[PDB]
């Protein structure tokens, strides 16, 4: 896989960020993570969801360098969102969220699974430490 530079435009949620990639604006969905949805209709946000959002936002808003890493599967979903791993100064947001107990590891999607073991491992650790959603 290859890391590509991007620039923060705006963080939308724990699992969605808007970036400038190859010169044009684009919305990315964090691969292999399942978060407590905050941007929803009649759902009254979700338990830990505002912490996952603040986490993601803190992480990318304060970073010097954002990078995007597409996987080898399908690269966009049916809503036109890029499907990728996001890196903030070398640290993967996807993994951080899971390590910190603010997301579960999602089912693999359309062949996109390169970092799934790494992610499942972070998830066991958080479970073991009874972090946030595992509290």
Swiss-Prot record:
It is found in: Secreted. It comes from the Bacteria. Residues 115-131 have a biased composition (Basic and acidic residues). Residues 115-135 are annotated as: Disordered. Ca(2+) binds at residues 15, 34-35. The active site is at 29, 37, 81. This is Nuclease A. It comes from Staphylococcus aureus. The lineage of its organism: Bacteria, Bacillati, Bacillota, Bacilli, Bacillales. The chain holds residues 89 to 223 of 231 of the full protein.
């Amino acid at each position: 896989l290859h890391k590509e530079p991007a620039t923060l435009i705006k963080a939308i949620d724990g699992d969605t960020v808007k970036l400038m990639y190859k010169g044009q604006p684009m919305v990315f969905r964090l691969l292999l993570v399942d978060i407590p949805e905050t941007k929803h209709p009649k759902k009254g946000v979700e338990k830990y969801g505002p912490e996952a959002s603040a986490f993601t936002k803190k992480m990318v808003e304060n970073a010097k360098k954002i990078e995007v890493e597409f996987d080898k599967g399908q690269r966009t979903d049916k809503y036109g969102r890029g499907l990728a791993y996001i890196y903030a100064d070398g640290k993967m947001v996807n993994e951080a969220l899971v390590r910190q107990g603010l997301a579960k590891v999602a089912y693999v999607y359309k062949g996109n699974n390169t970092h799934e073991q790494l992610l499942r491992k972070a998830e066991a650790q958080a479970k073991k430490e009874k972090l946030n959603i595992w509290s």
